[PDB]
Amino acid sequence: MHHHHHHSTSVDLGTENLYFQSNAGKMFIGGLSWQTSPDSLRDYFSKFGEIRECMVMRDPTTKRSRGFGFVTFADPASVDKVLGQPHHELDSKTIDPKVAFPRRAQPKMVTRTKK
């Protein structure tokens, strides 16, 4: 009665869009350096706790970094340890490592006073 559709022309990978359970637990590392690599971040942060995965935003056009990334800690205790420690130095400069924040809903009424 019902038929399933399949795609034949696929260029991008399909291993991320299936998982929806694991989302929270990541840390957004800001102000990284030009030398800081996802491996460097994993190597540096692995020193505070255990990391599951690391990611640094780069451009395939220039291969240059934007100065921000994330780190996925495999321990809830490491997030606690990092949360208490606000100061983080990398390449002799202070960067902005913080835990992800959720989105909020919208209230009622916008325009109350009409002319």
From Swiss-Prot:
Tissue expression as described in the entry: Ubiquitous; detected at low levels.
Localisation per UniProt entry: Cytoplasm
Induction (free text): Up-regulated in astrocytes after brain injury.
Keywords: Acetylation, Chromosomal rearrangement, Cytoplasm, Methylation, Phosphoprotein, Repeat, RNA-binding, Ubl conjugation
Modifications the protein undergoes after translation, according to the UniProt entry: Phosphorylated. Ubiquitinated by the RHOBTB2-CUL3-RBX1 ubiquitin ligase complex.
Coiled coil regions in record: none
Any Gene Ontology CC annotation: cytoplasm
Domain RRM, first and last residues per copy: 25-115
Single GO BP term: regulation of translation
Subunit structure: Interacts with RHOBTB2; the interaction is necessary for MSI2 ubiquitination and degradation.
Family label: Belongs to the Musashi family.
Protein name: RNA-binding protein Musashi homolog 2
Annotated organism of origin: Homo sapiens (Human)
Entire-sequence positions represented here: 21 to 111 of 328
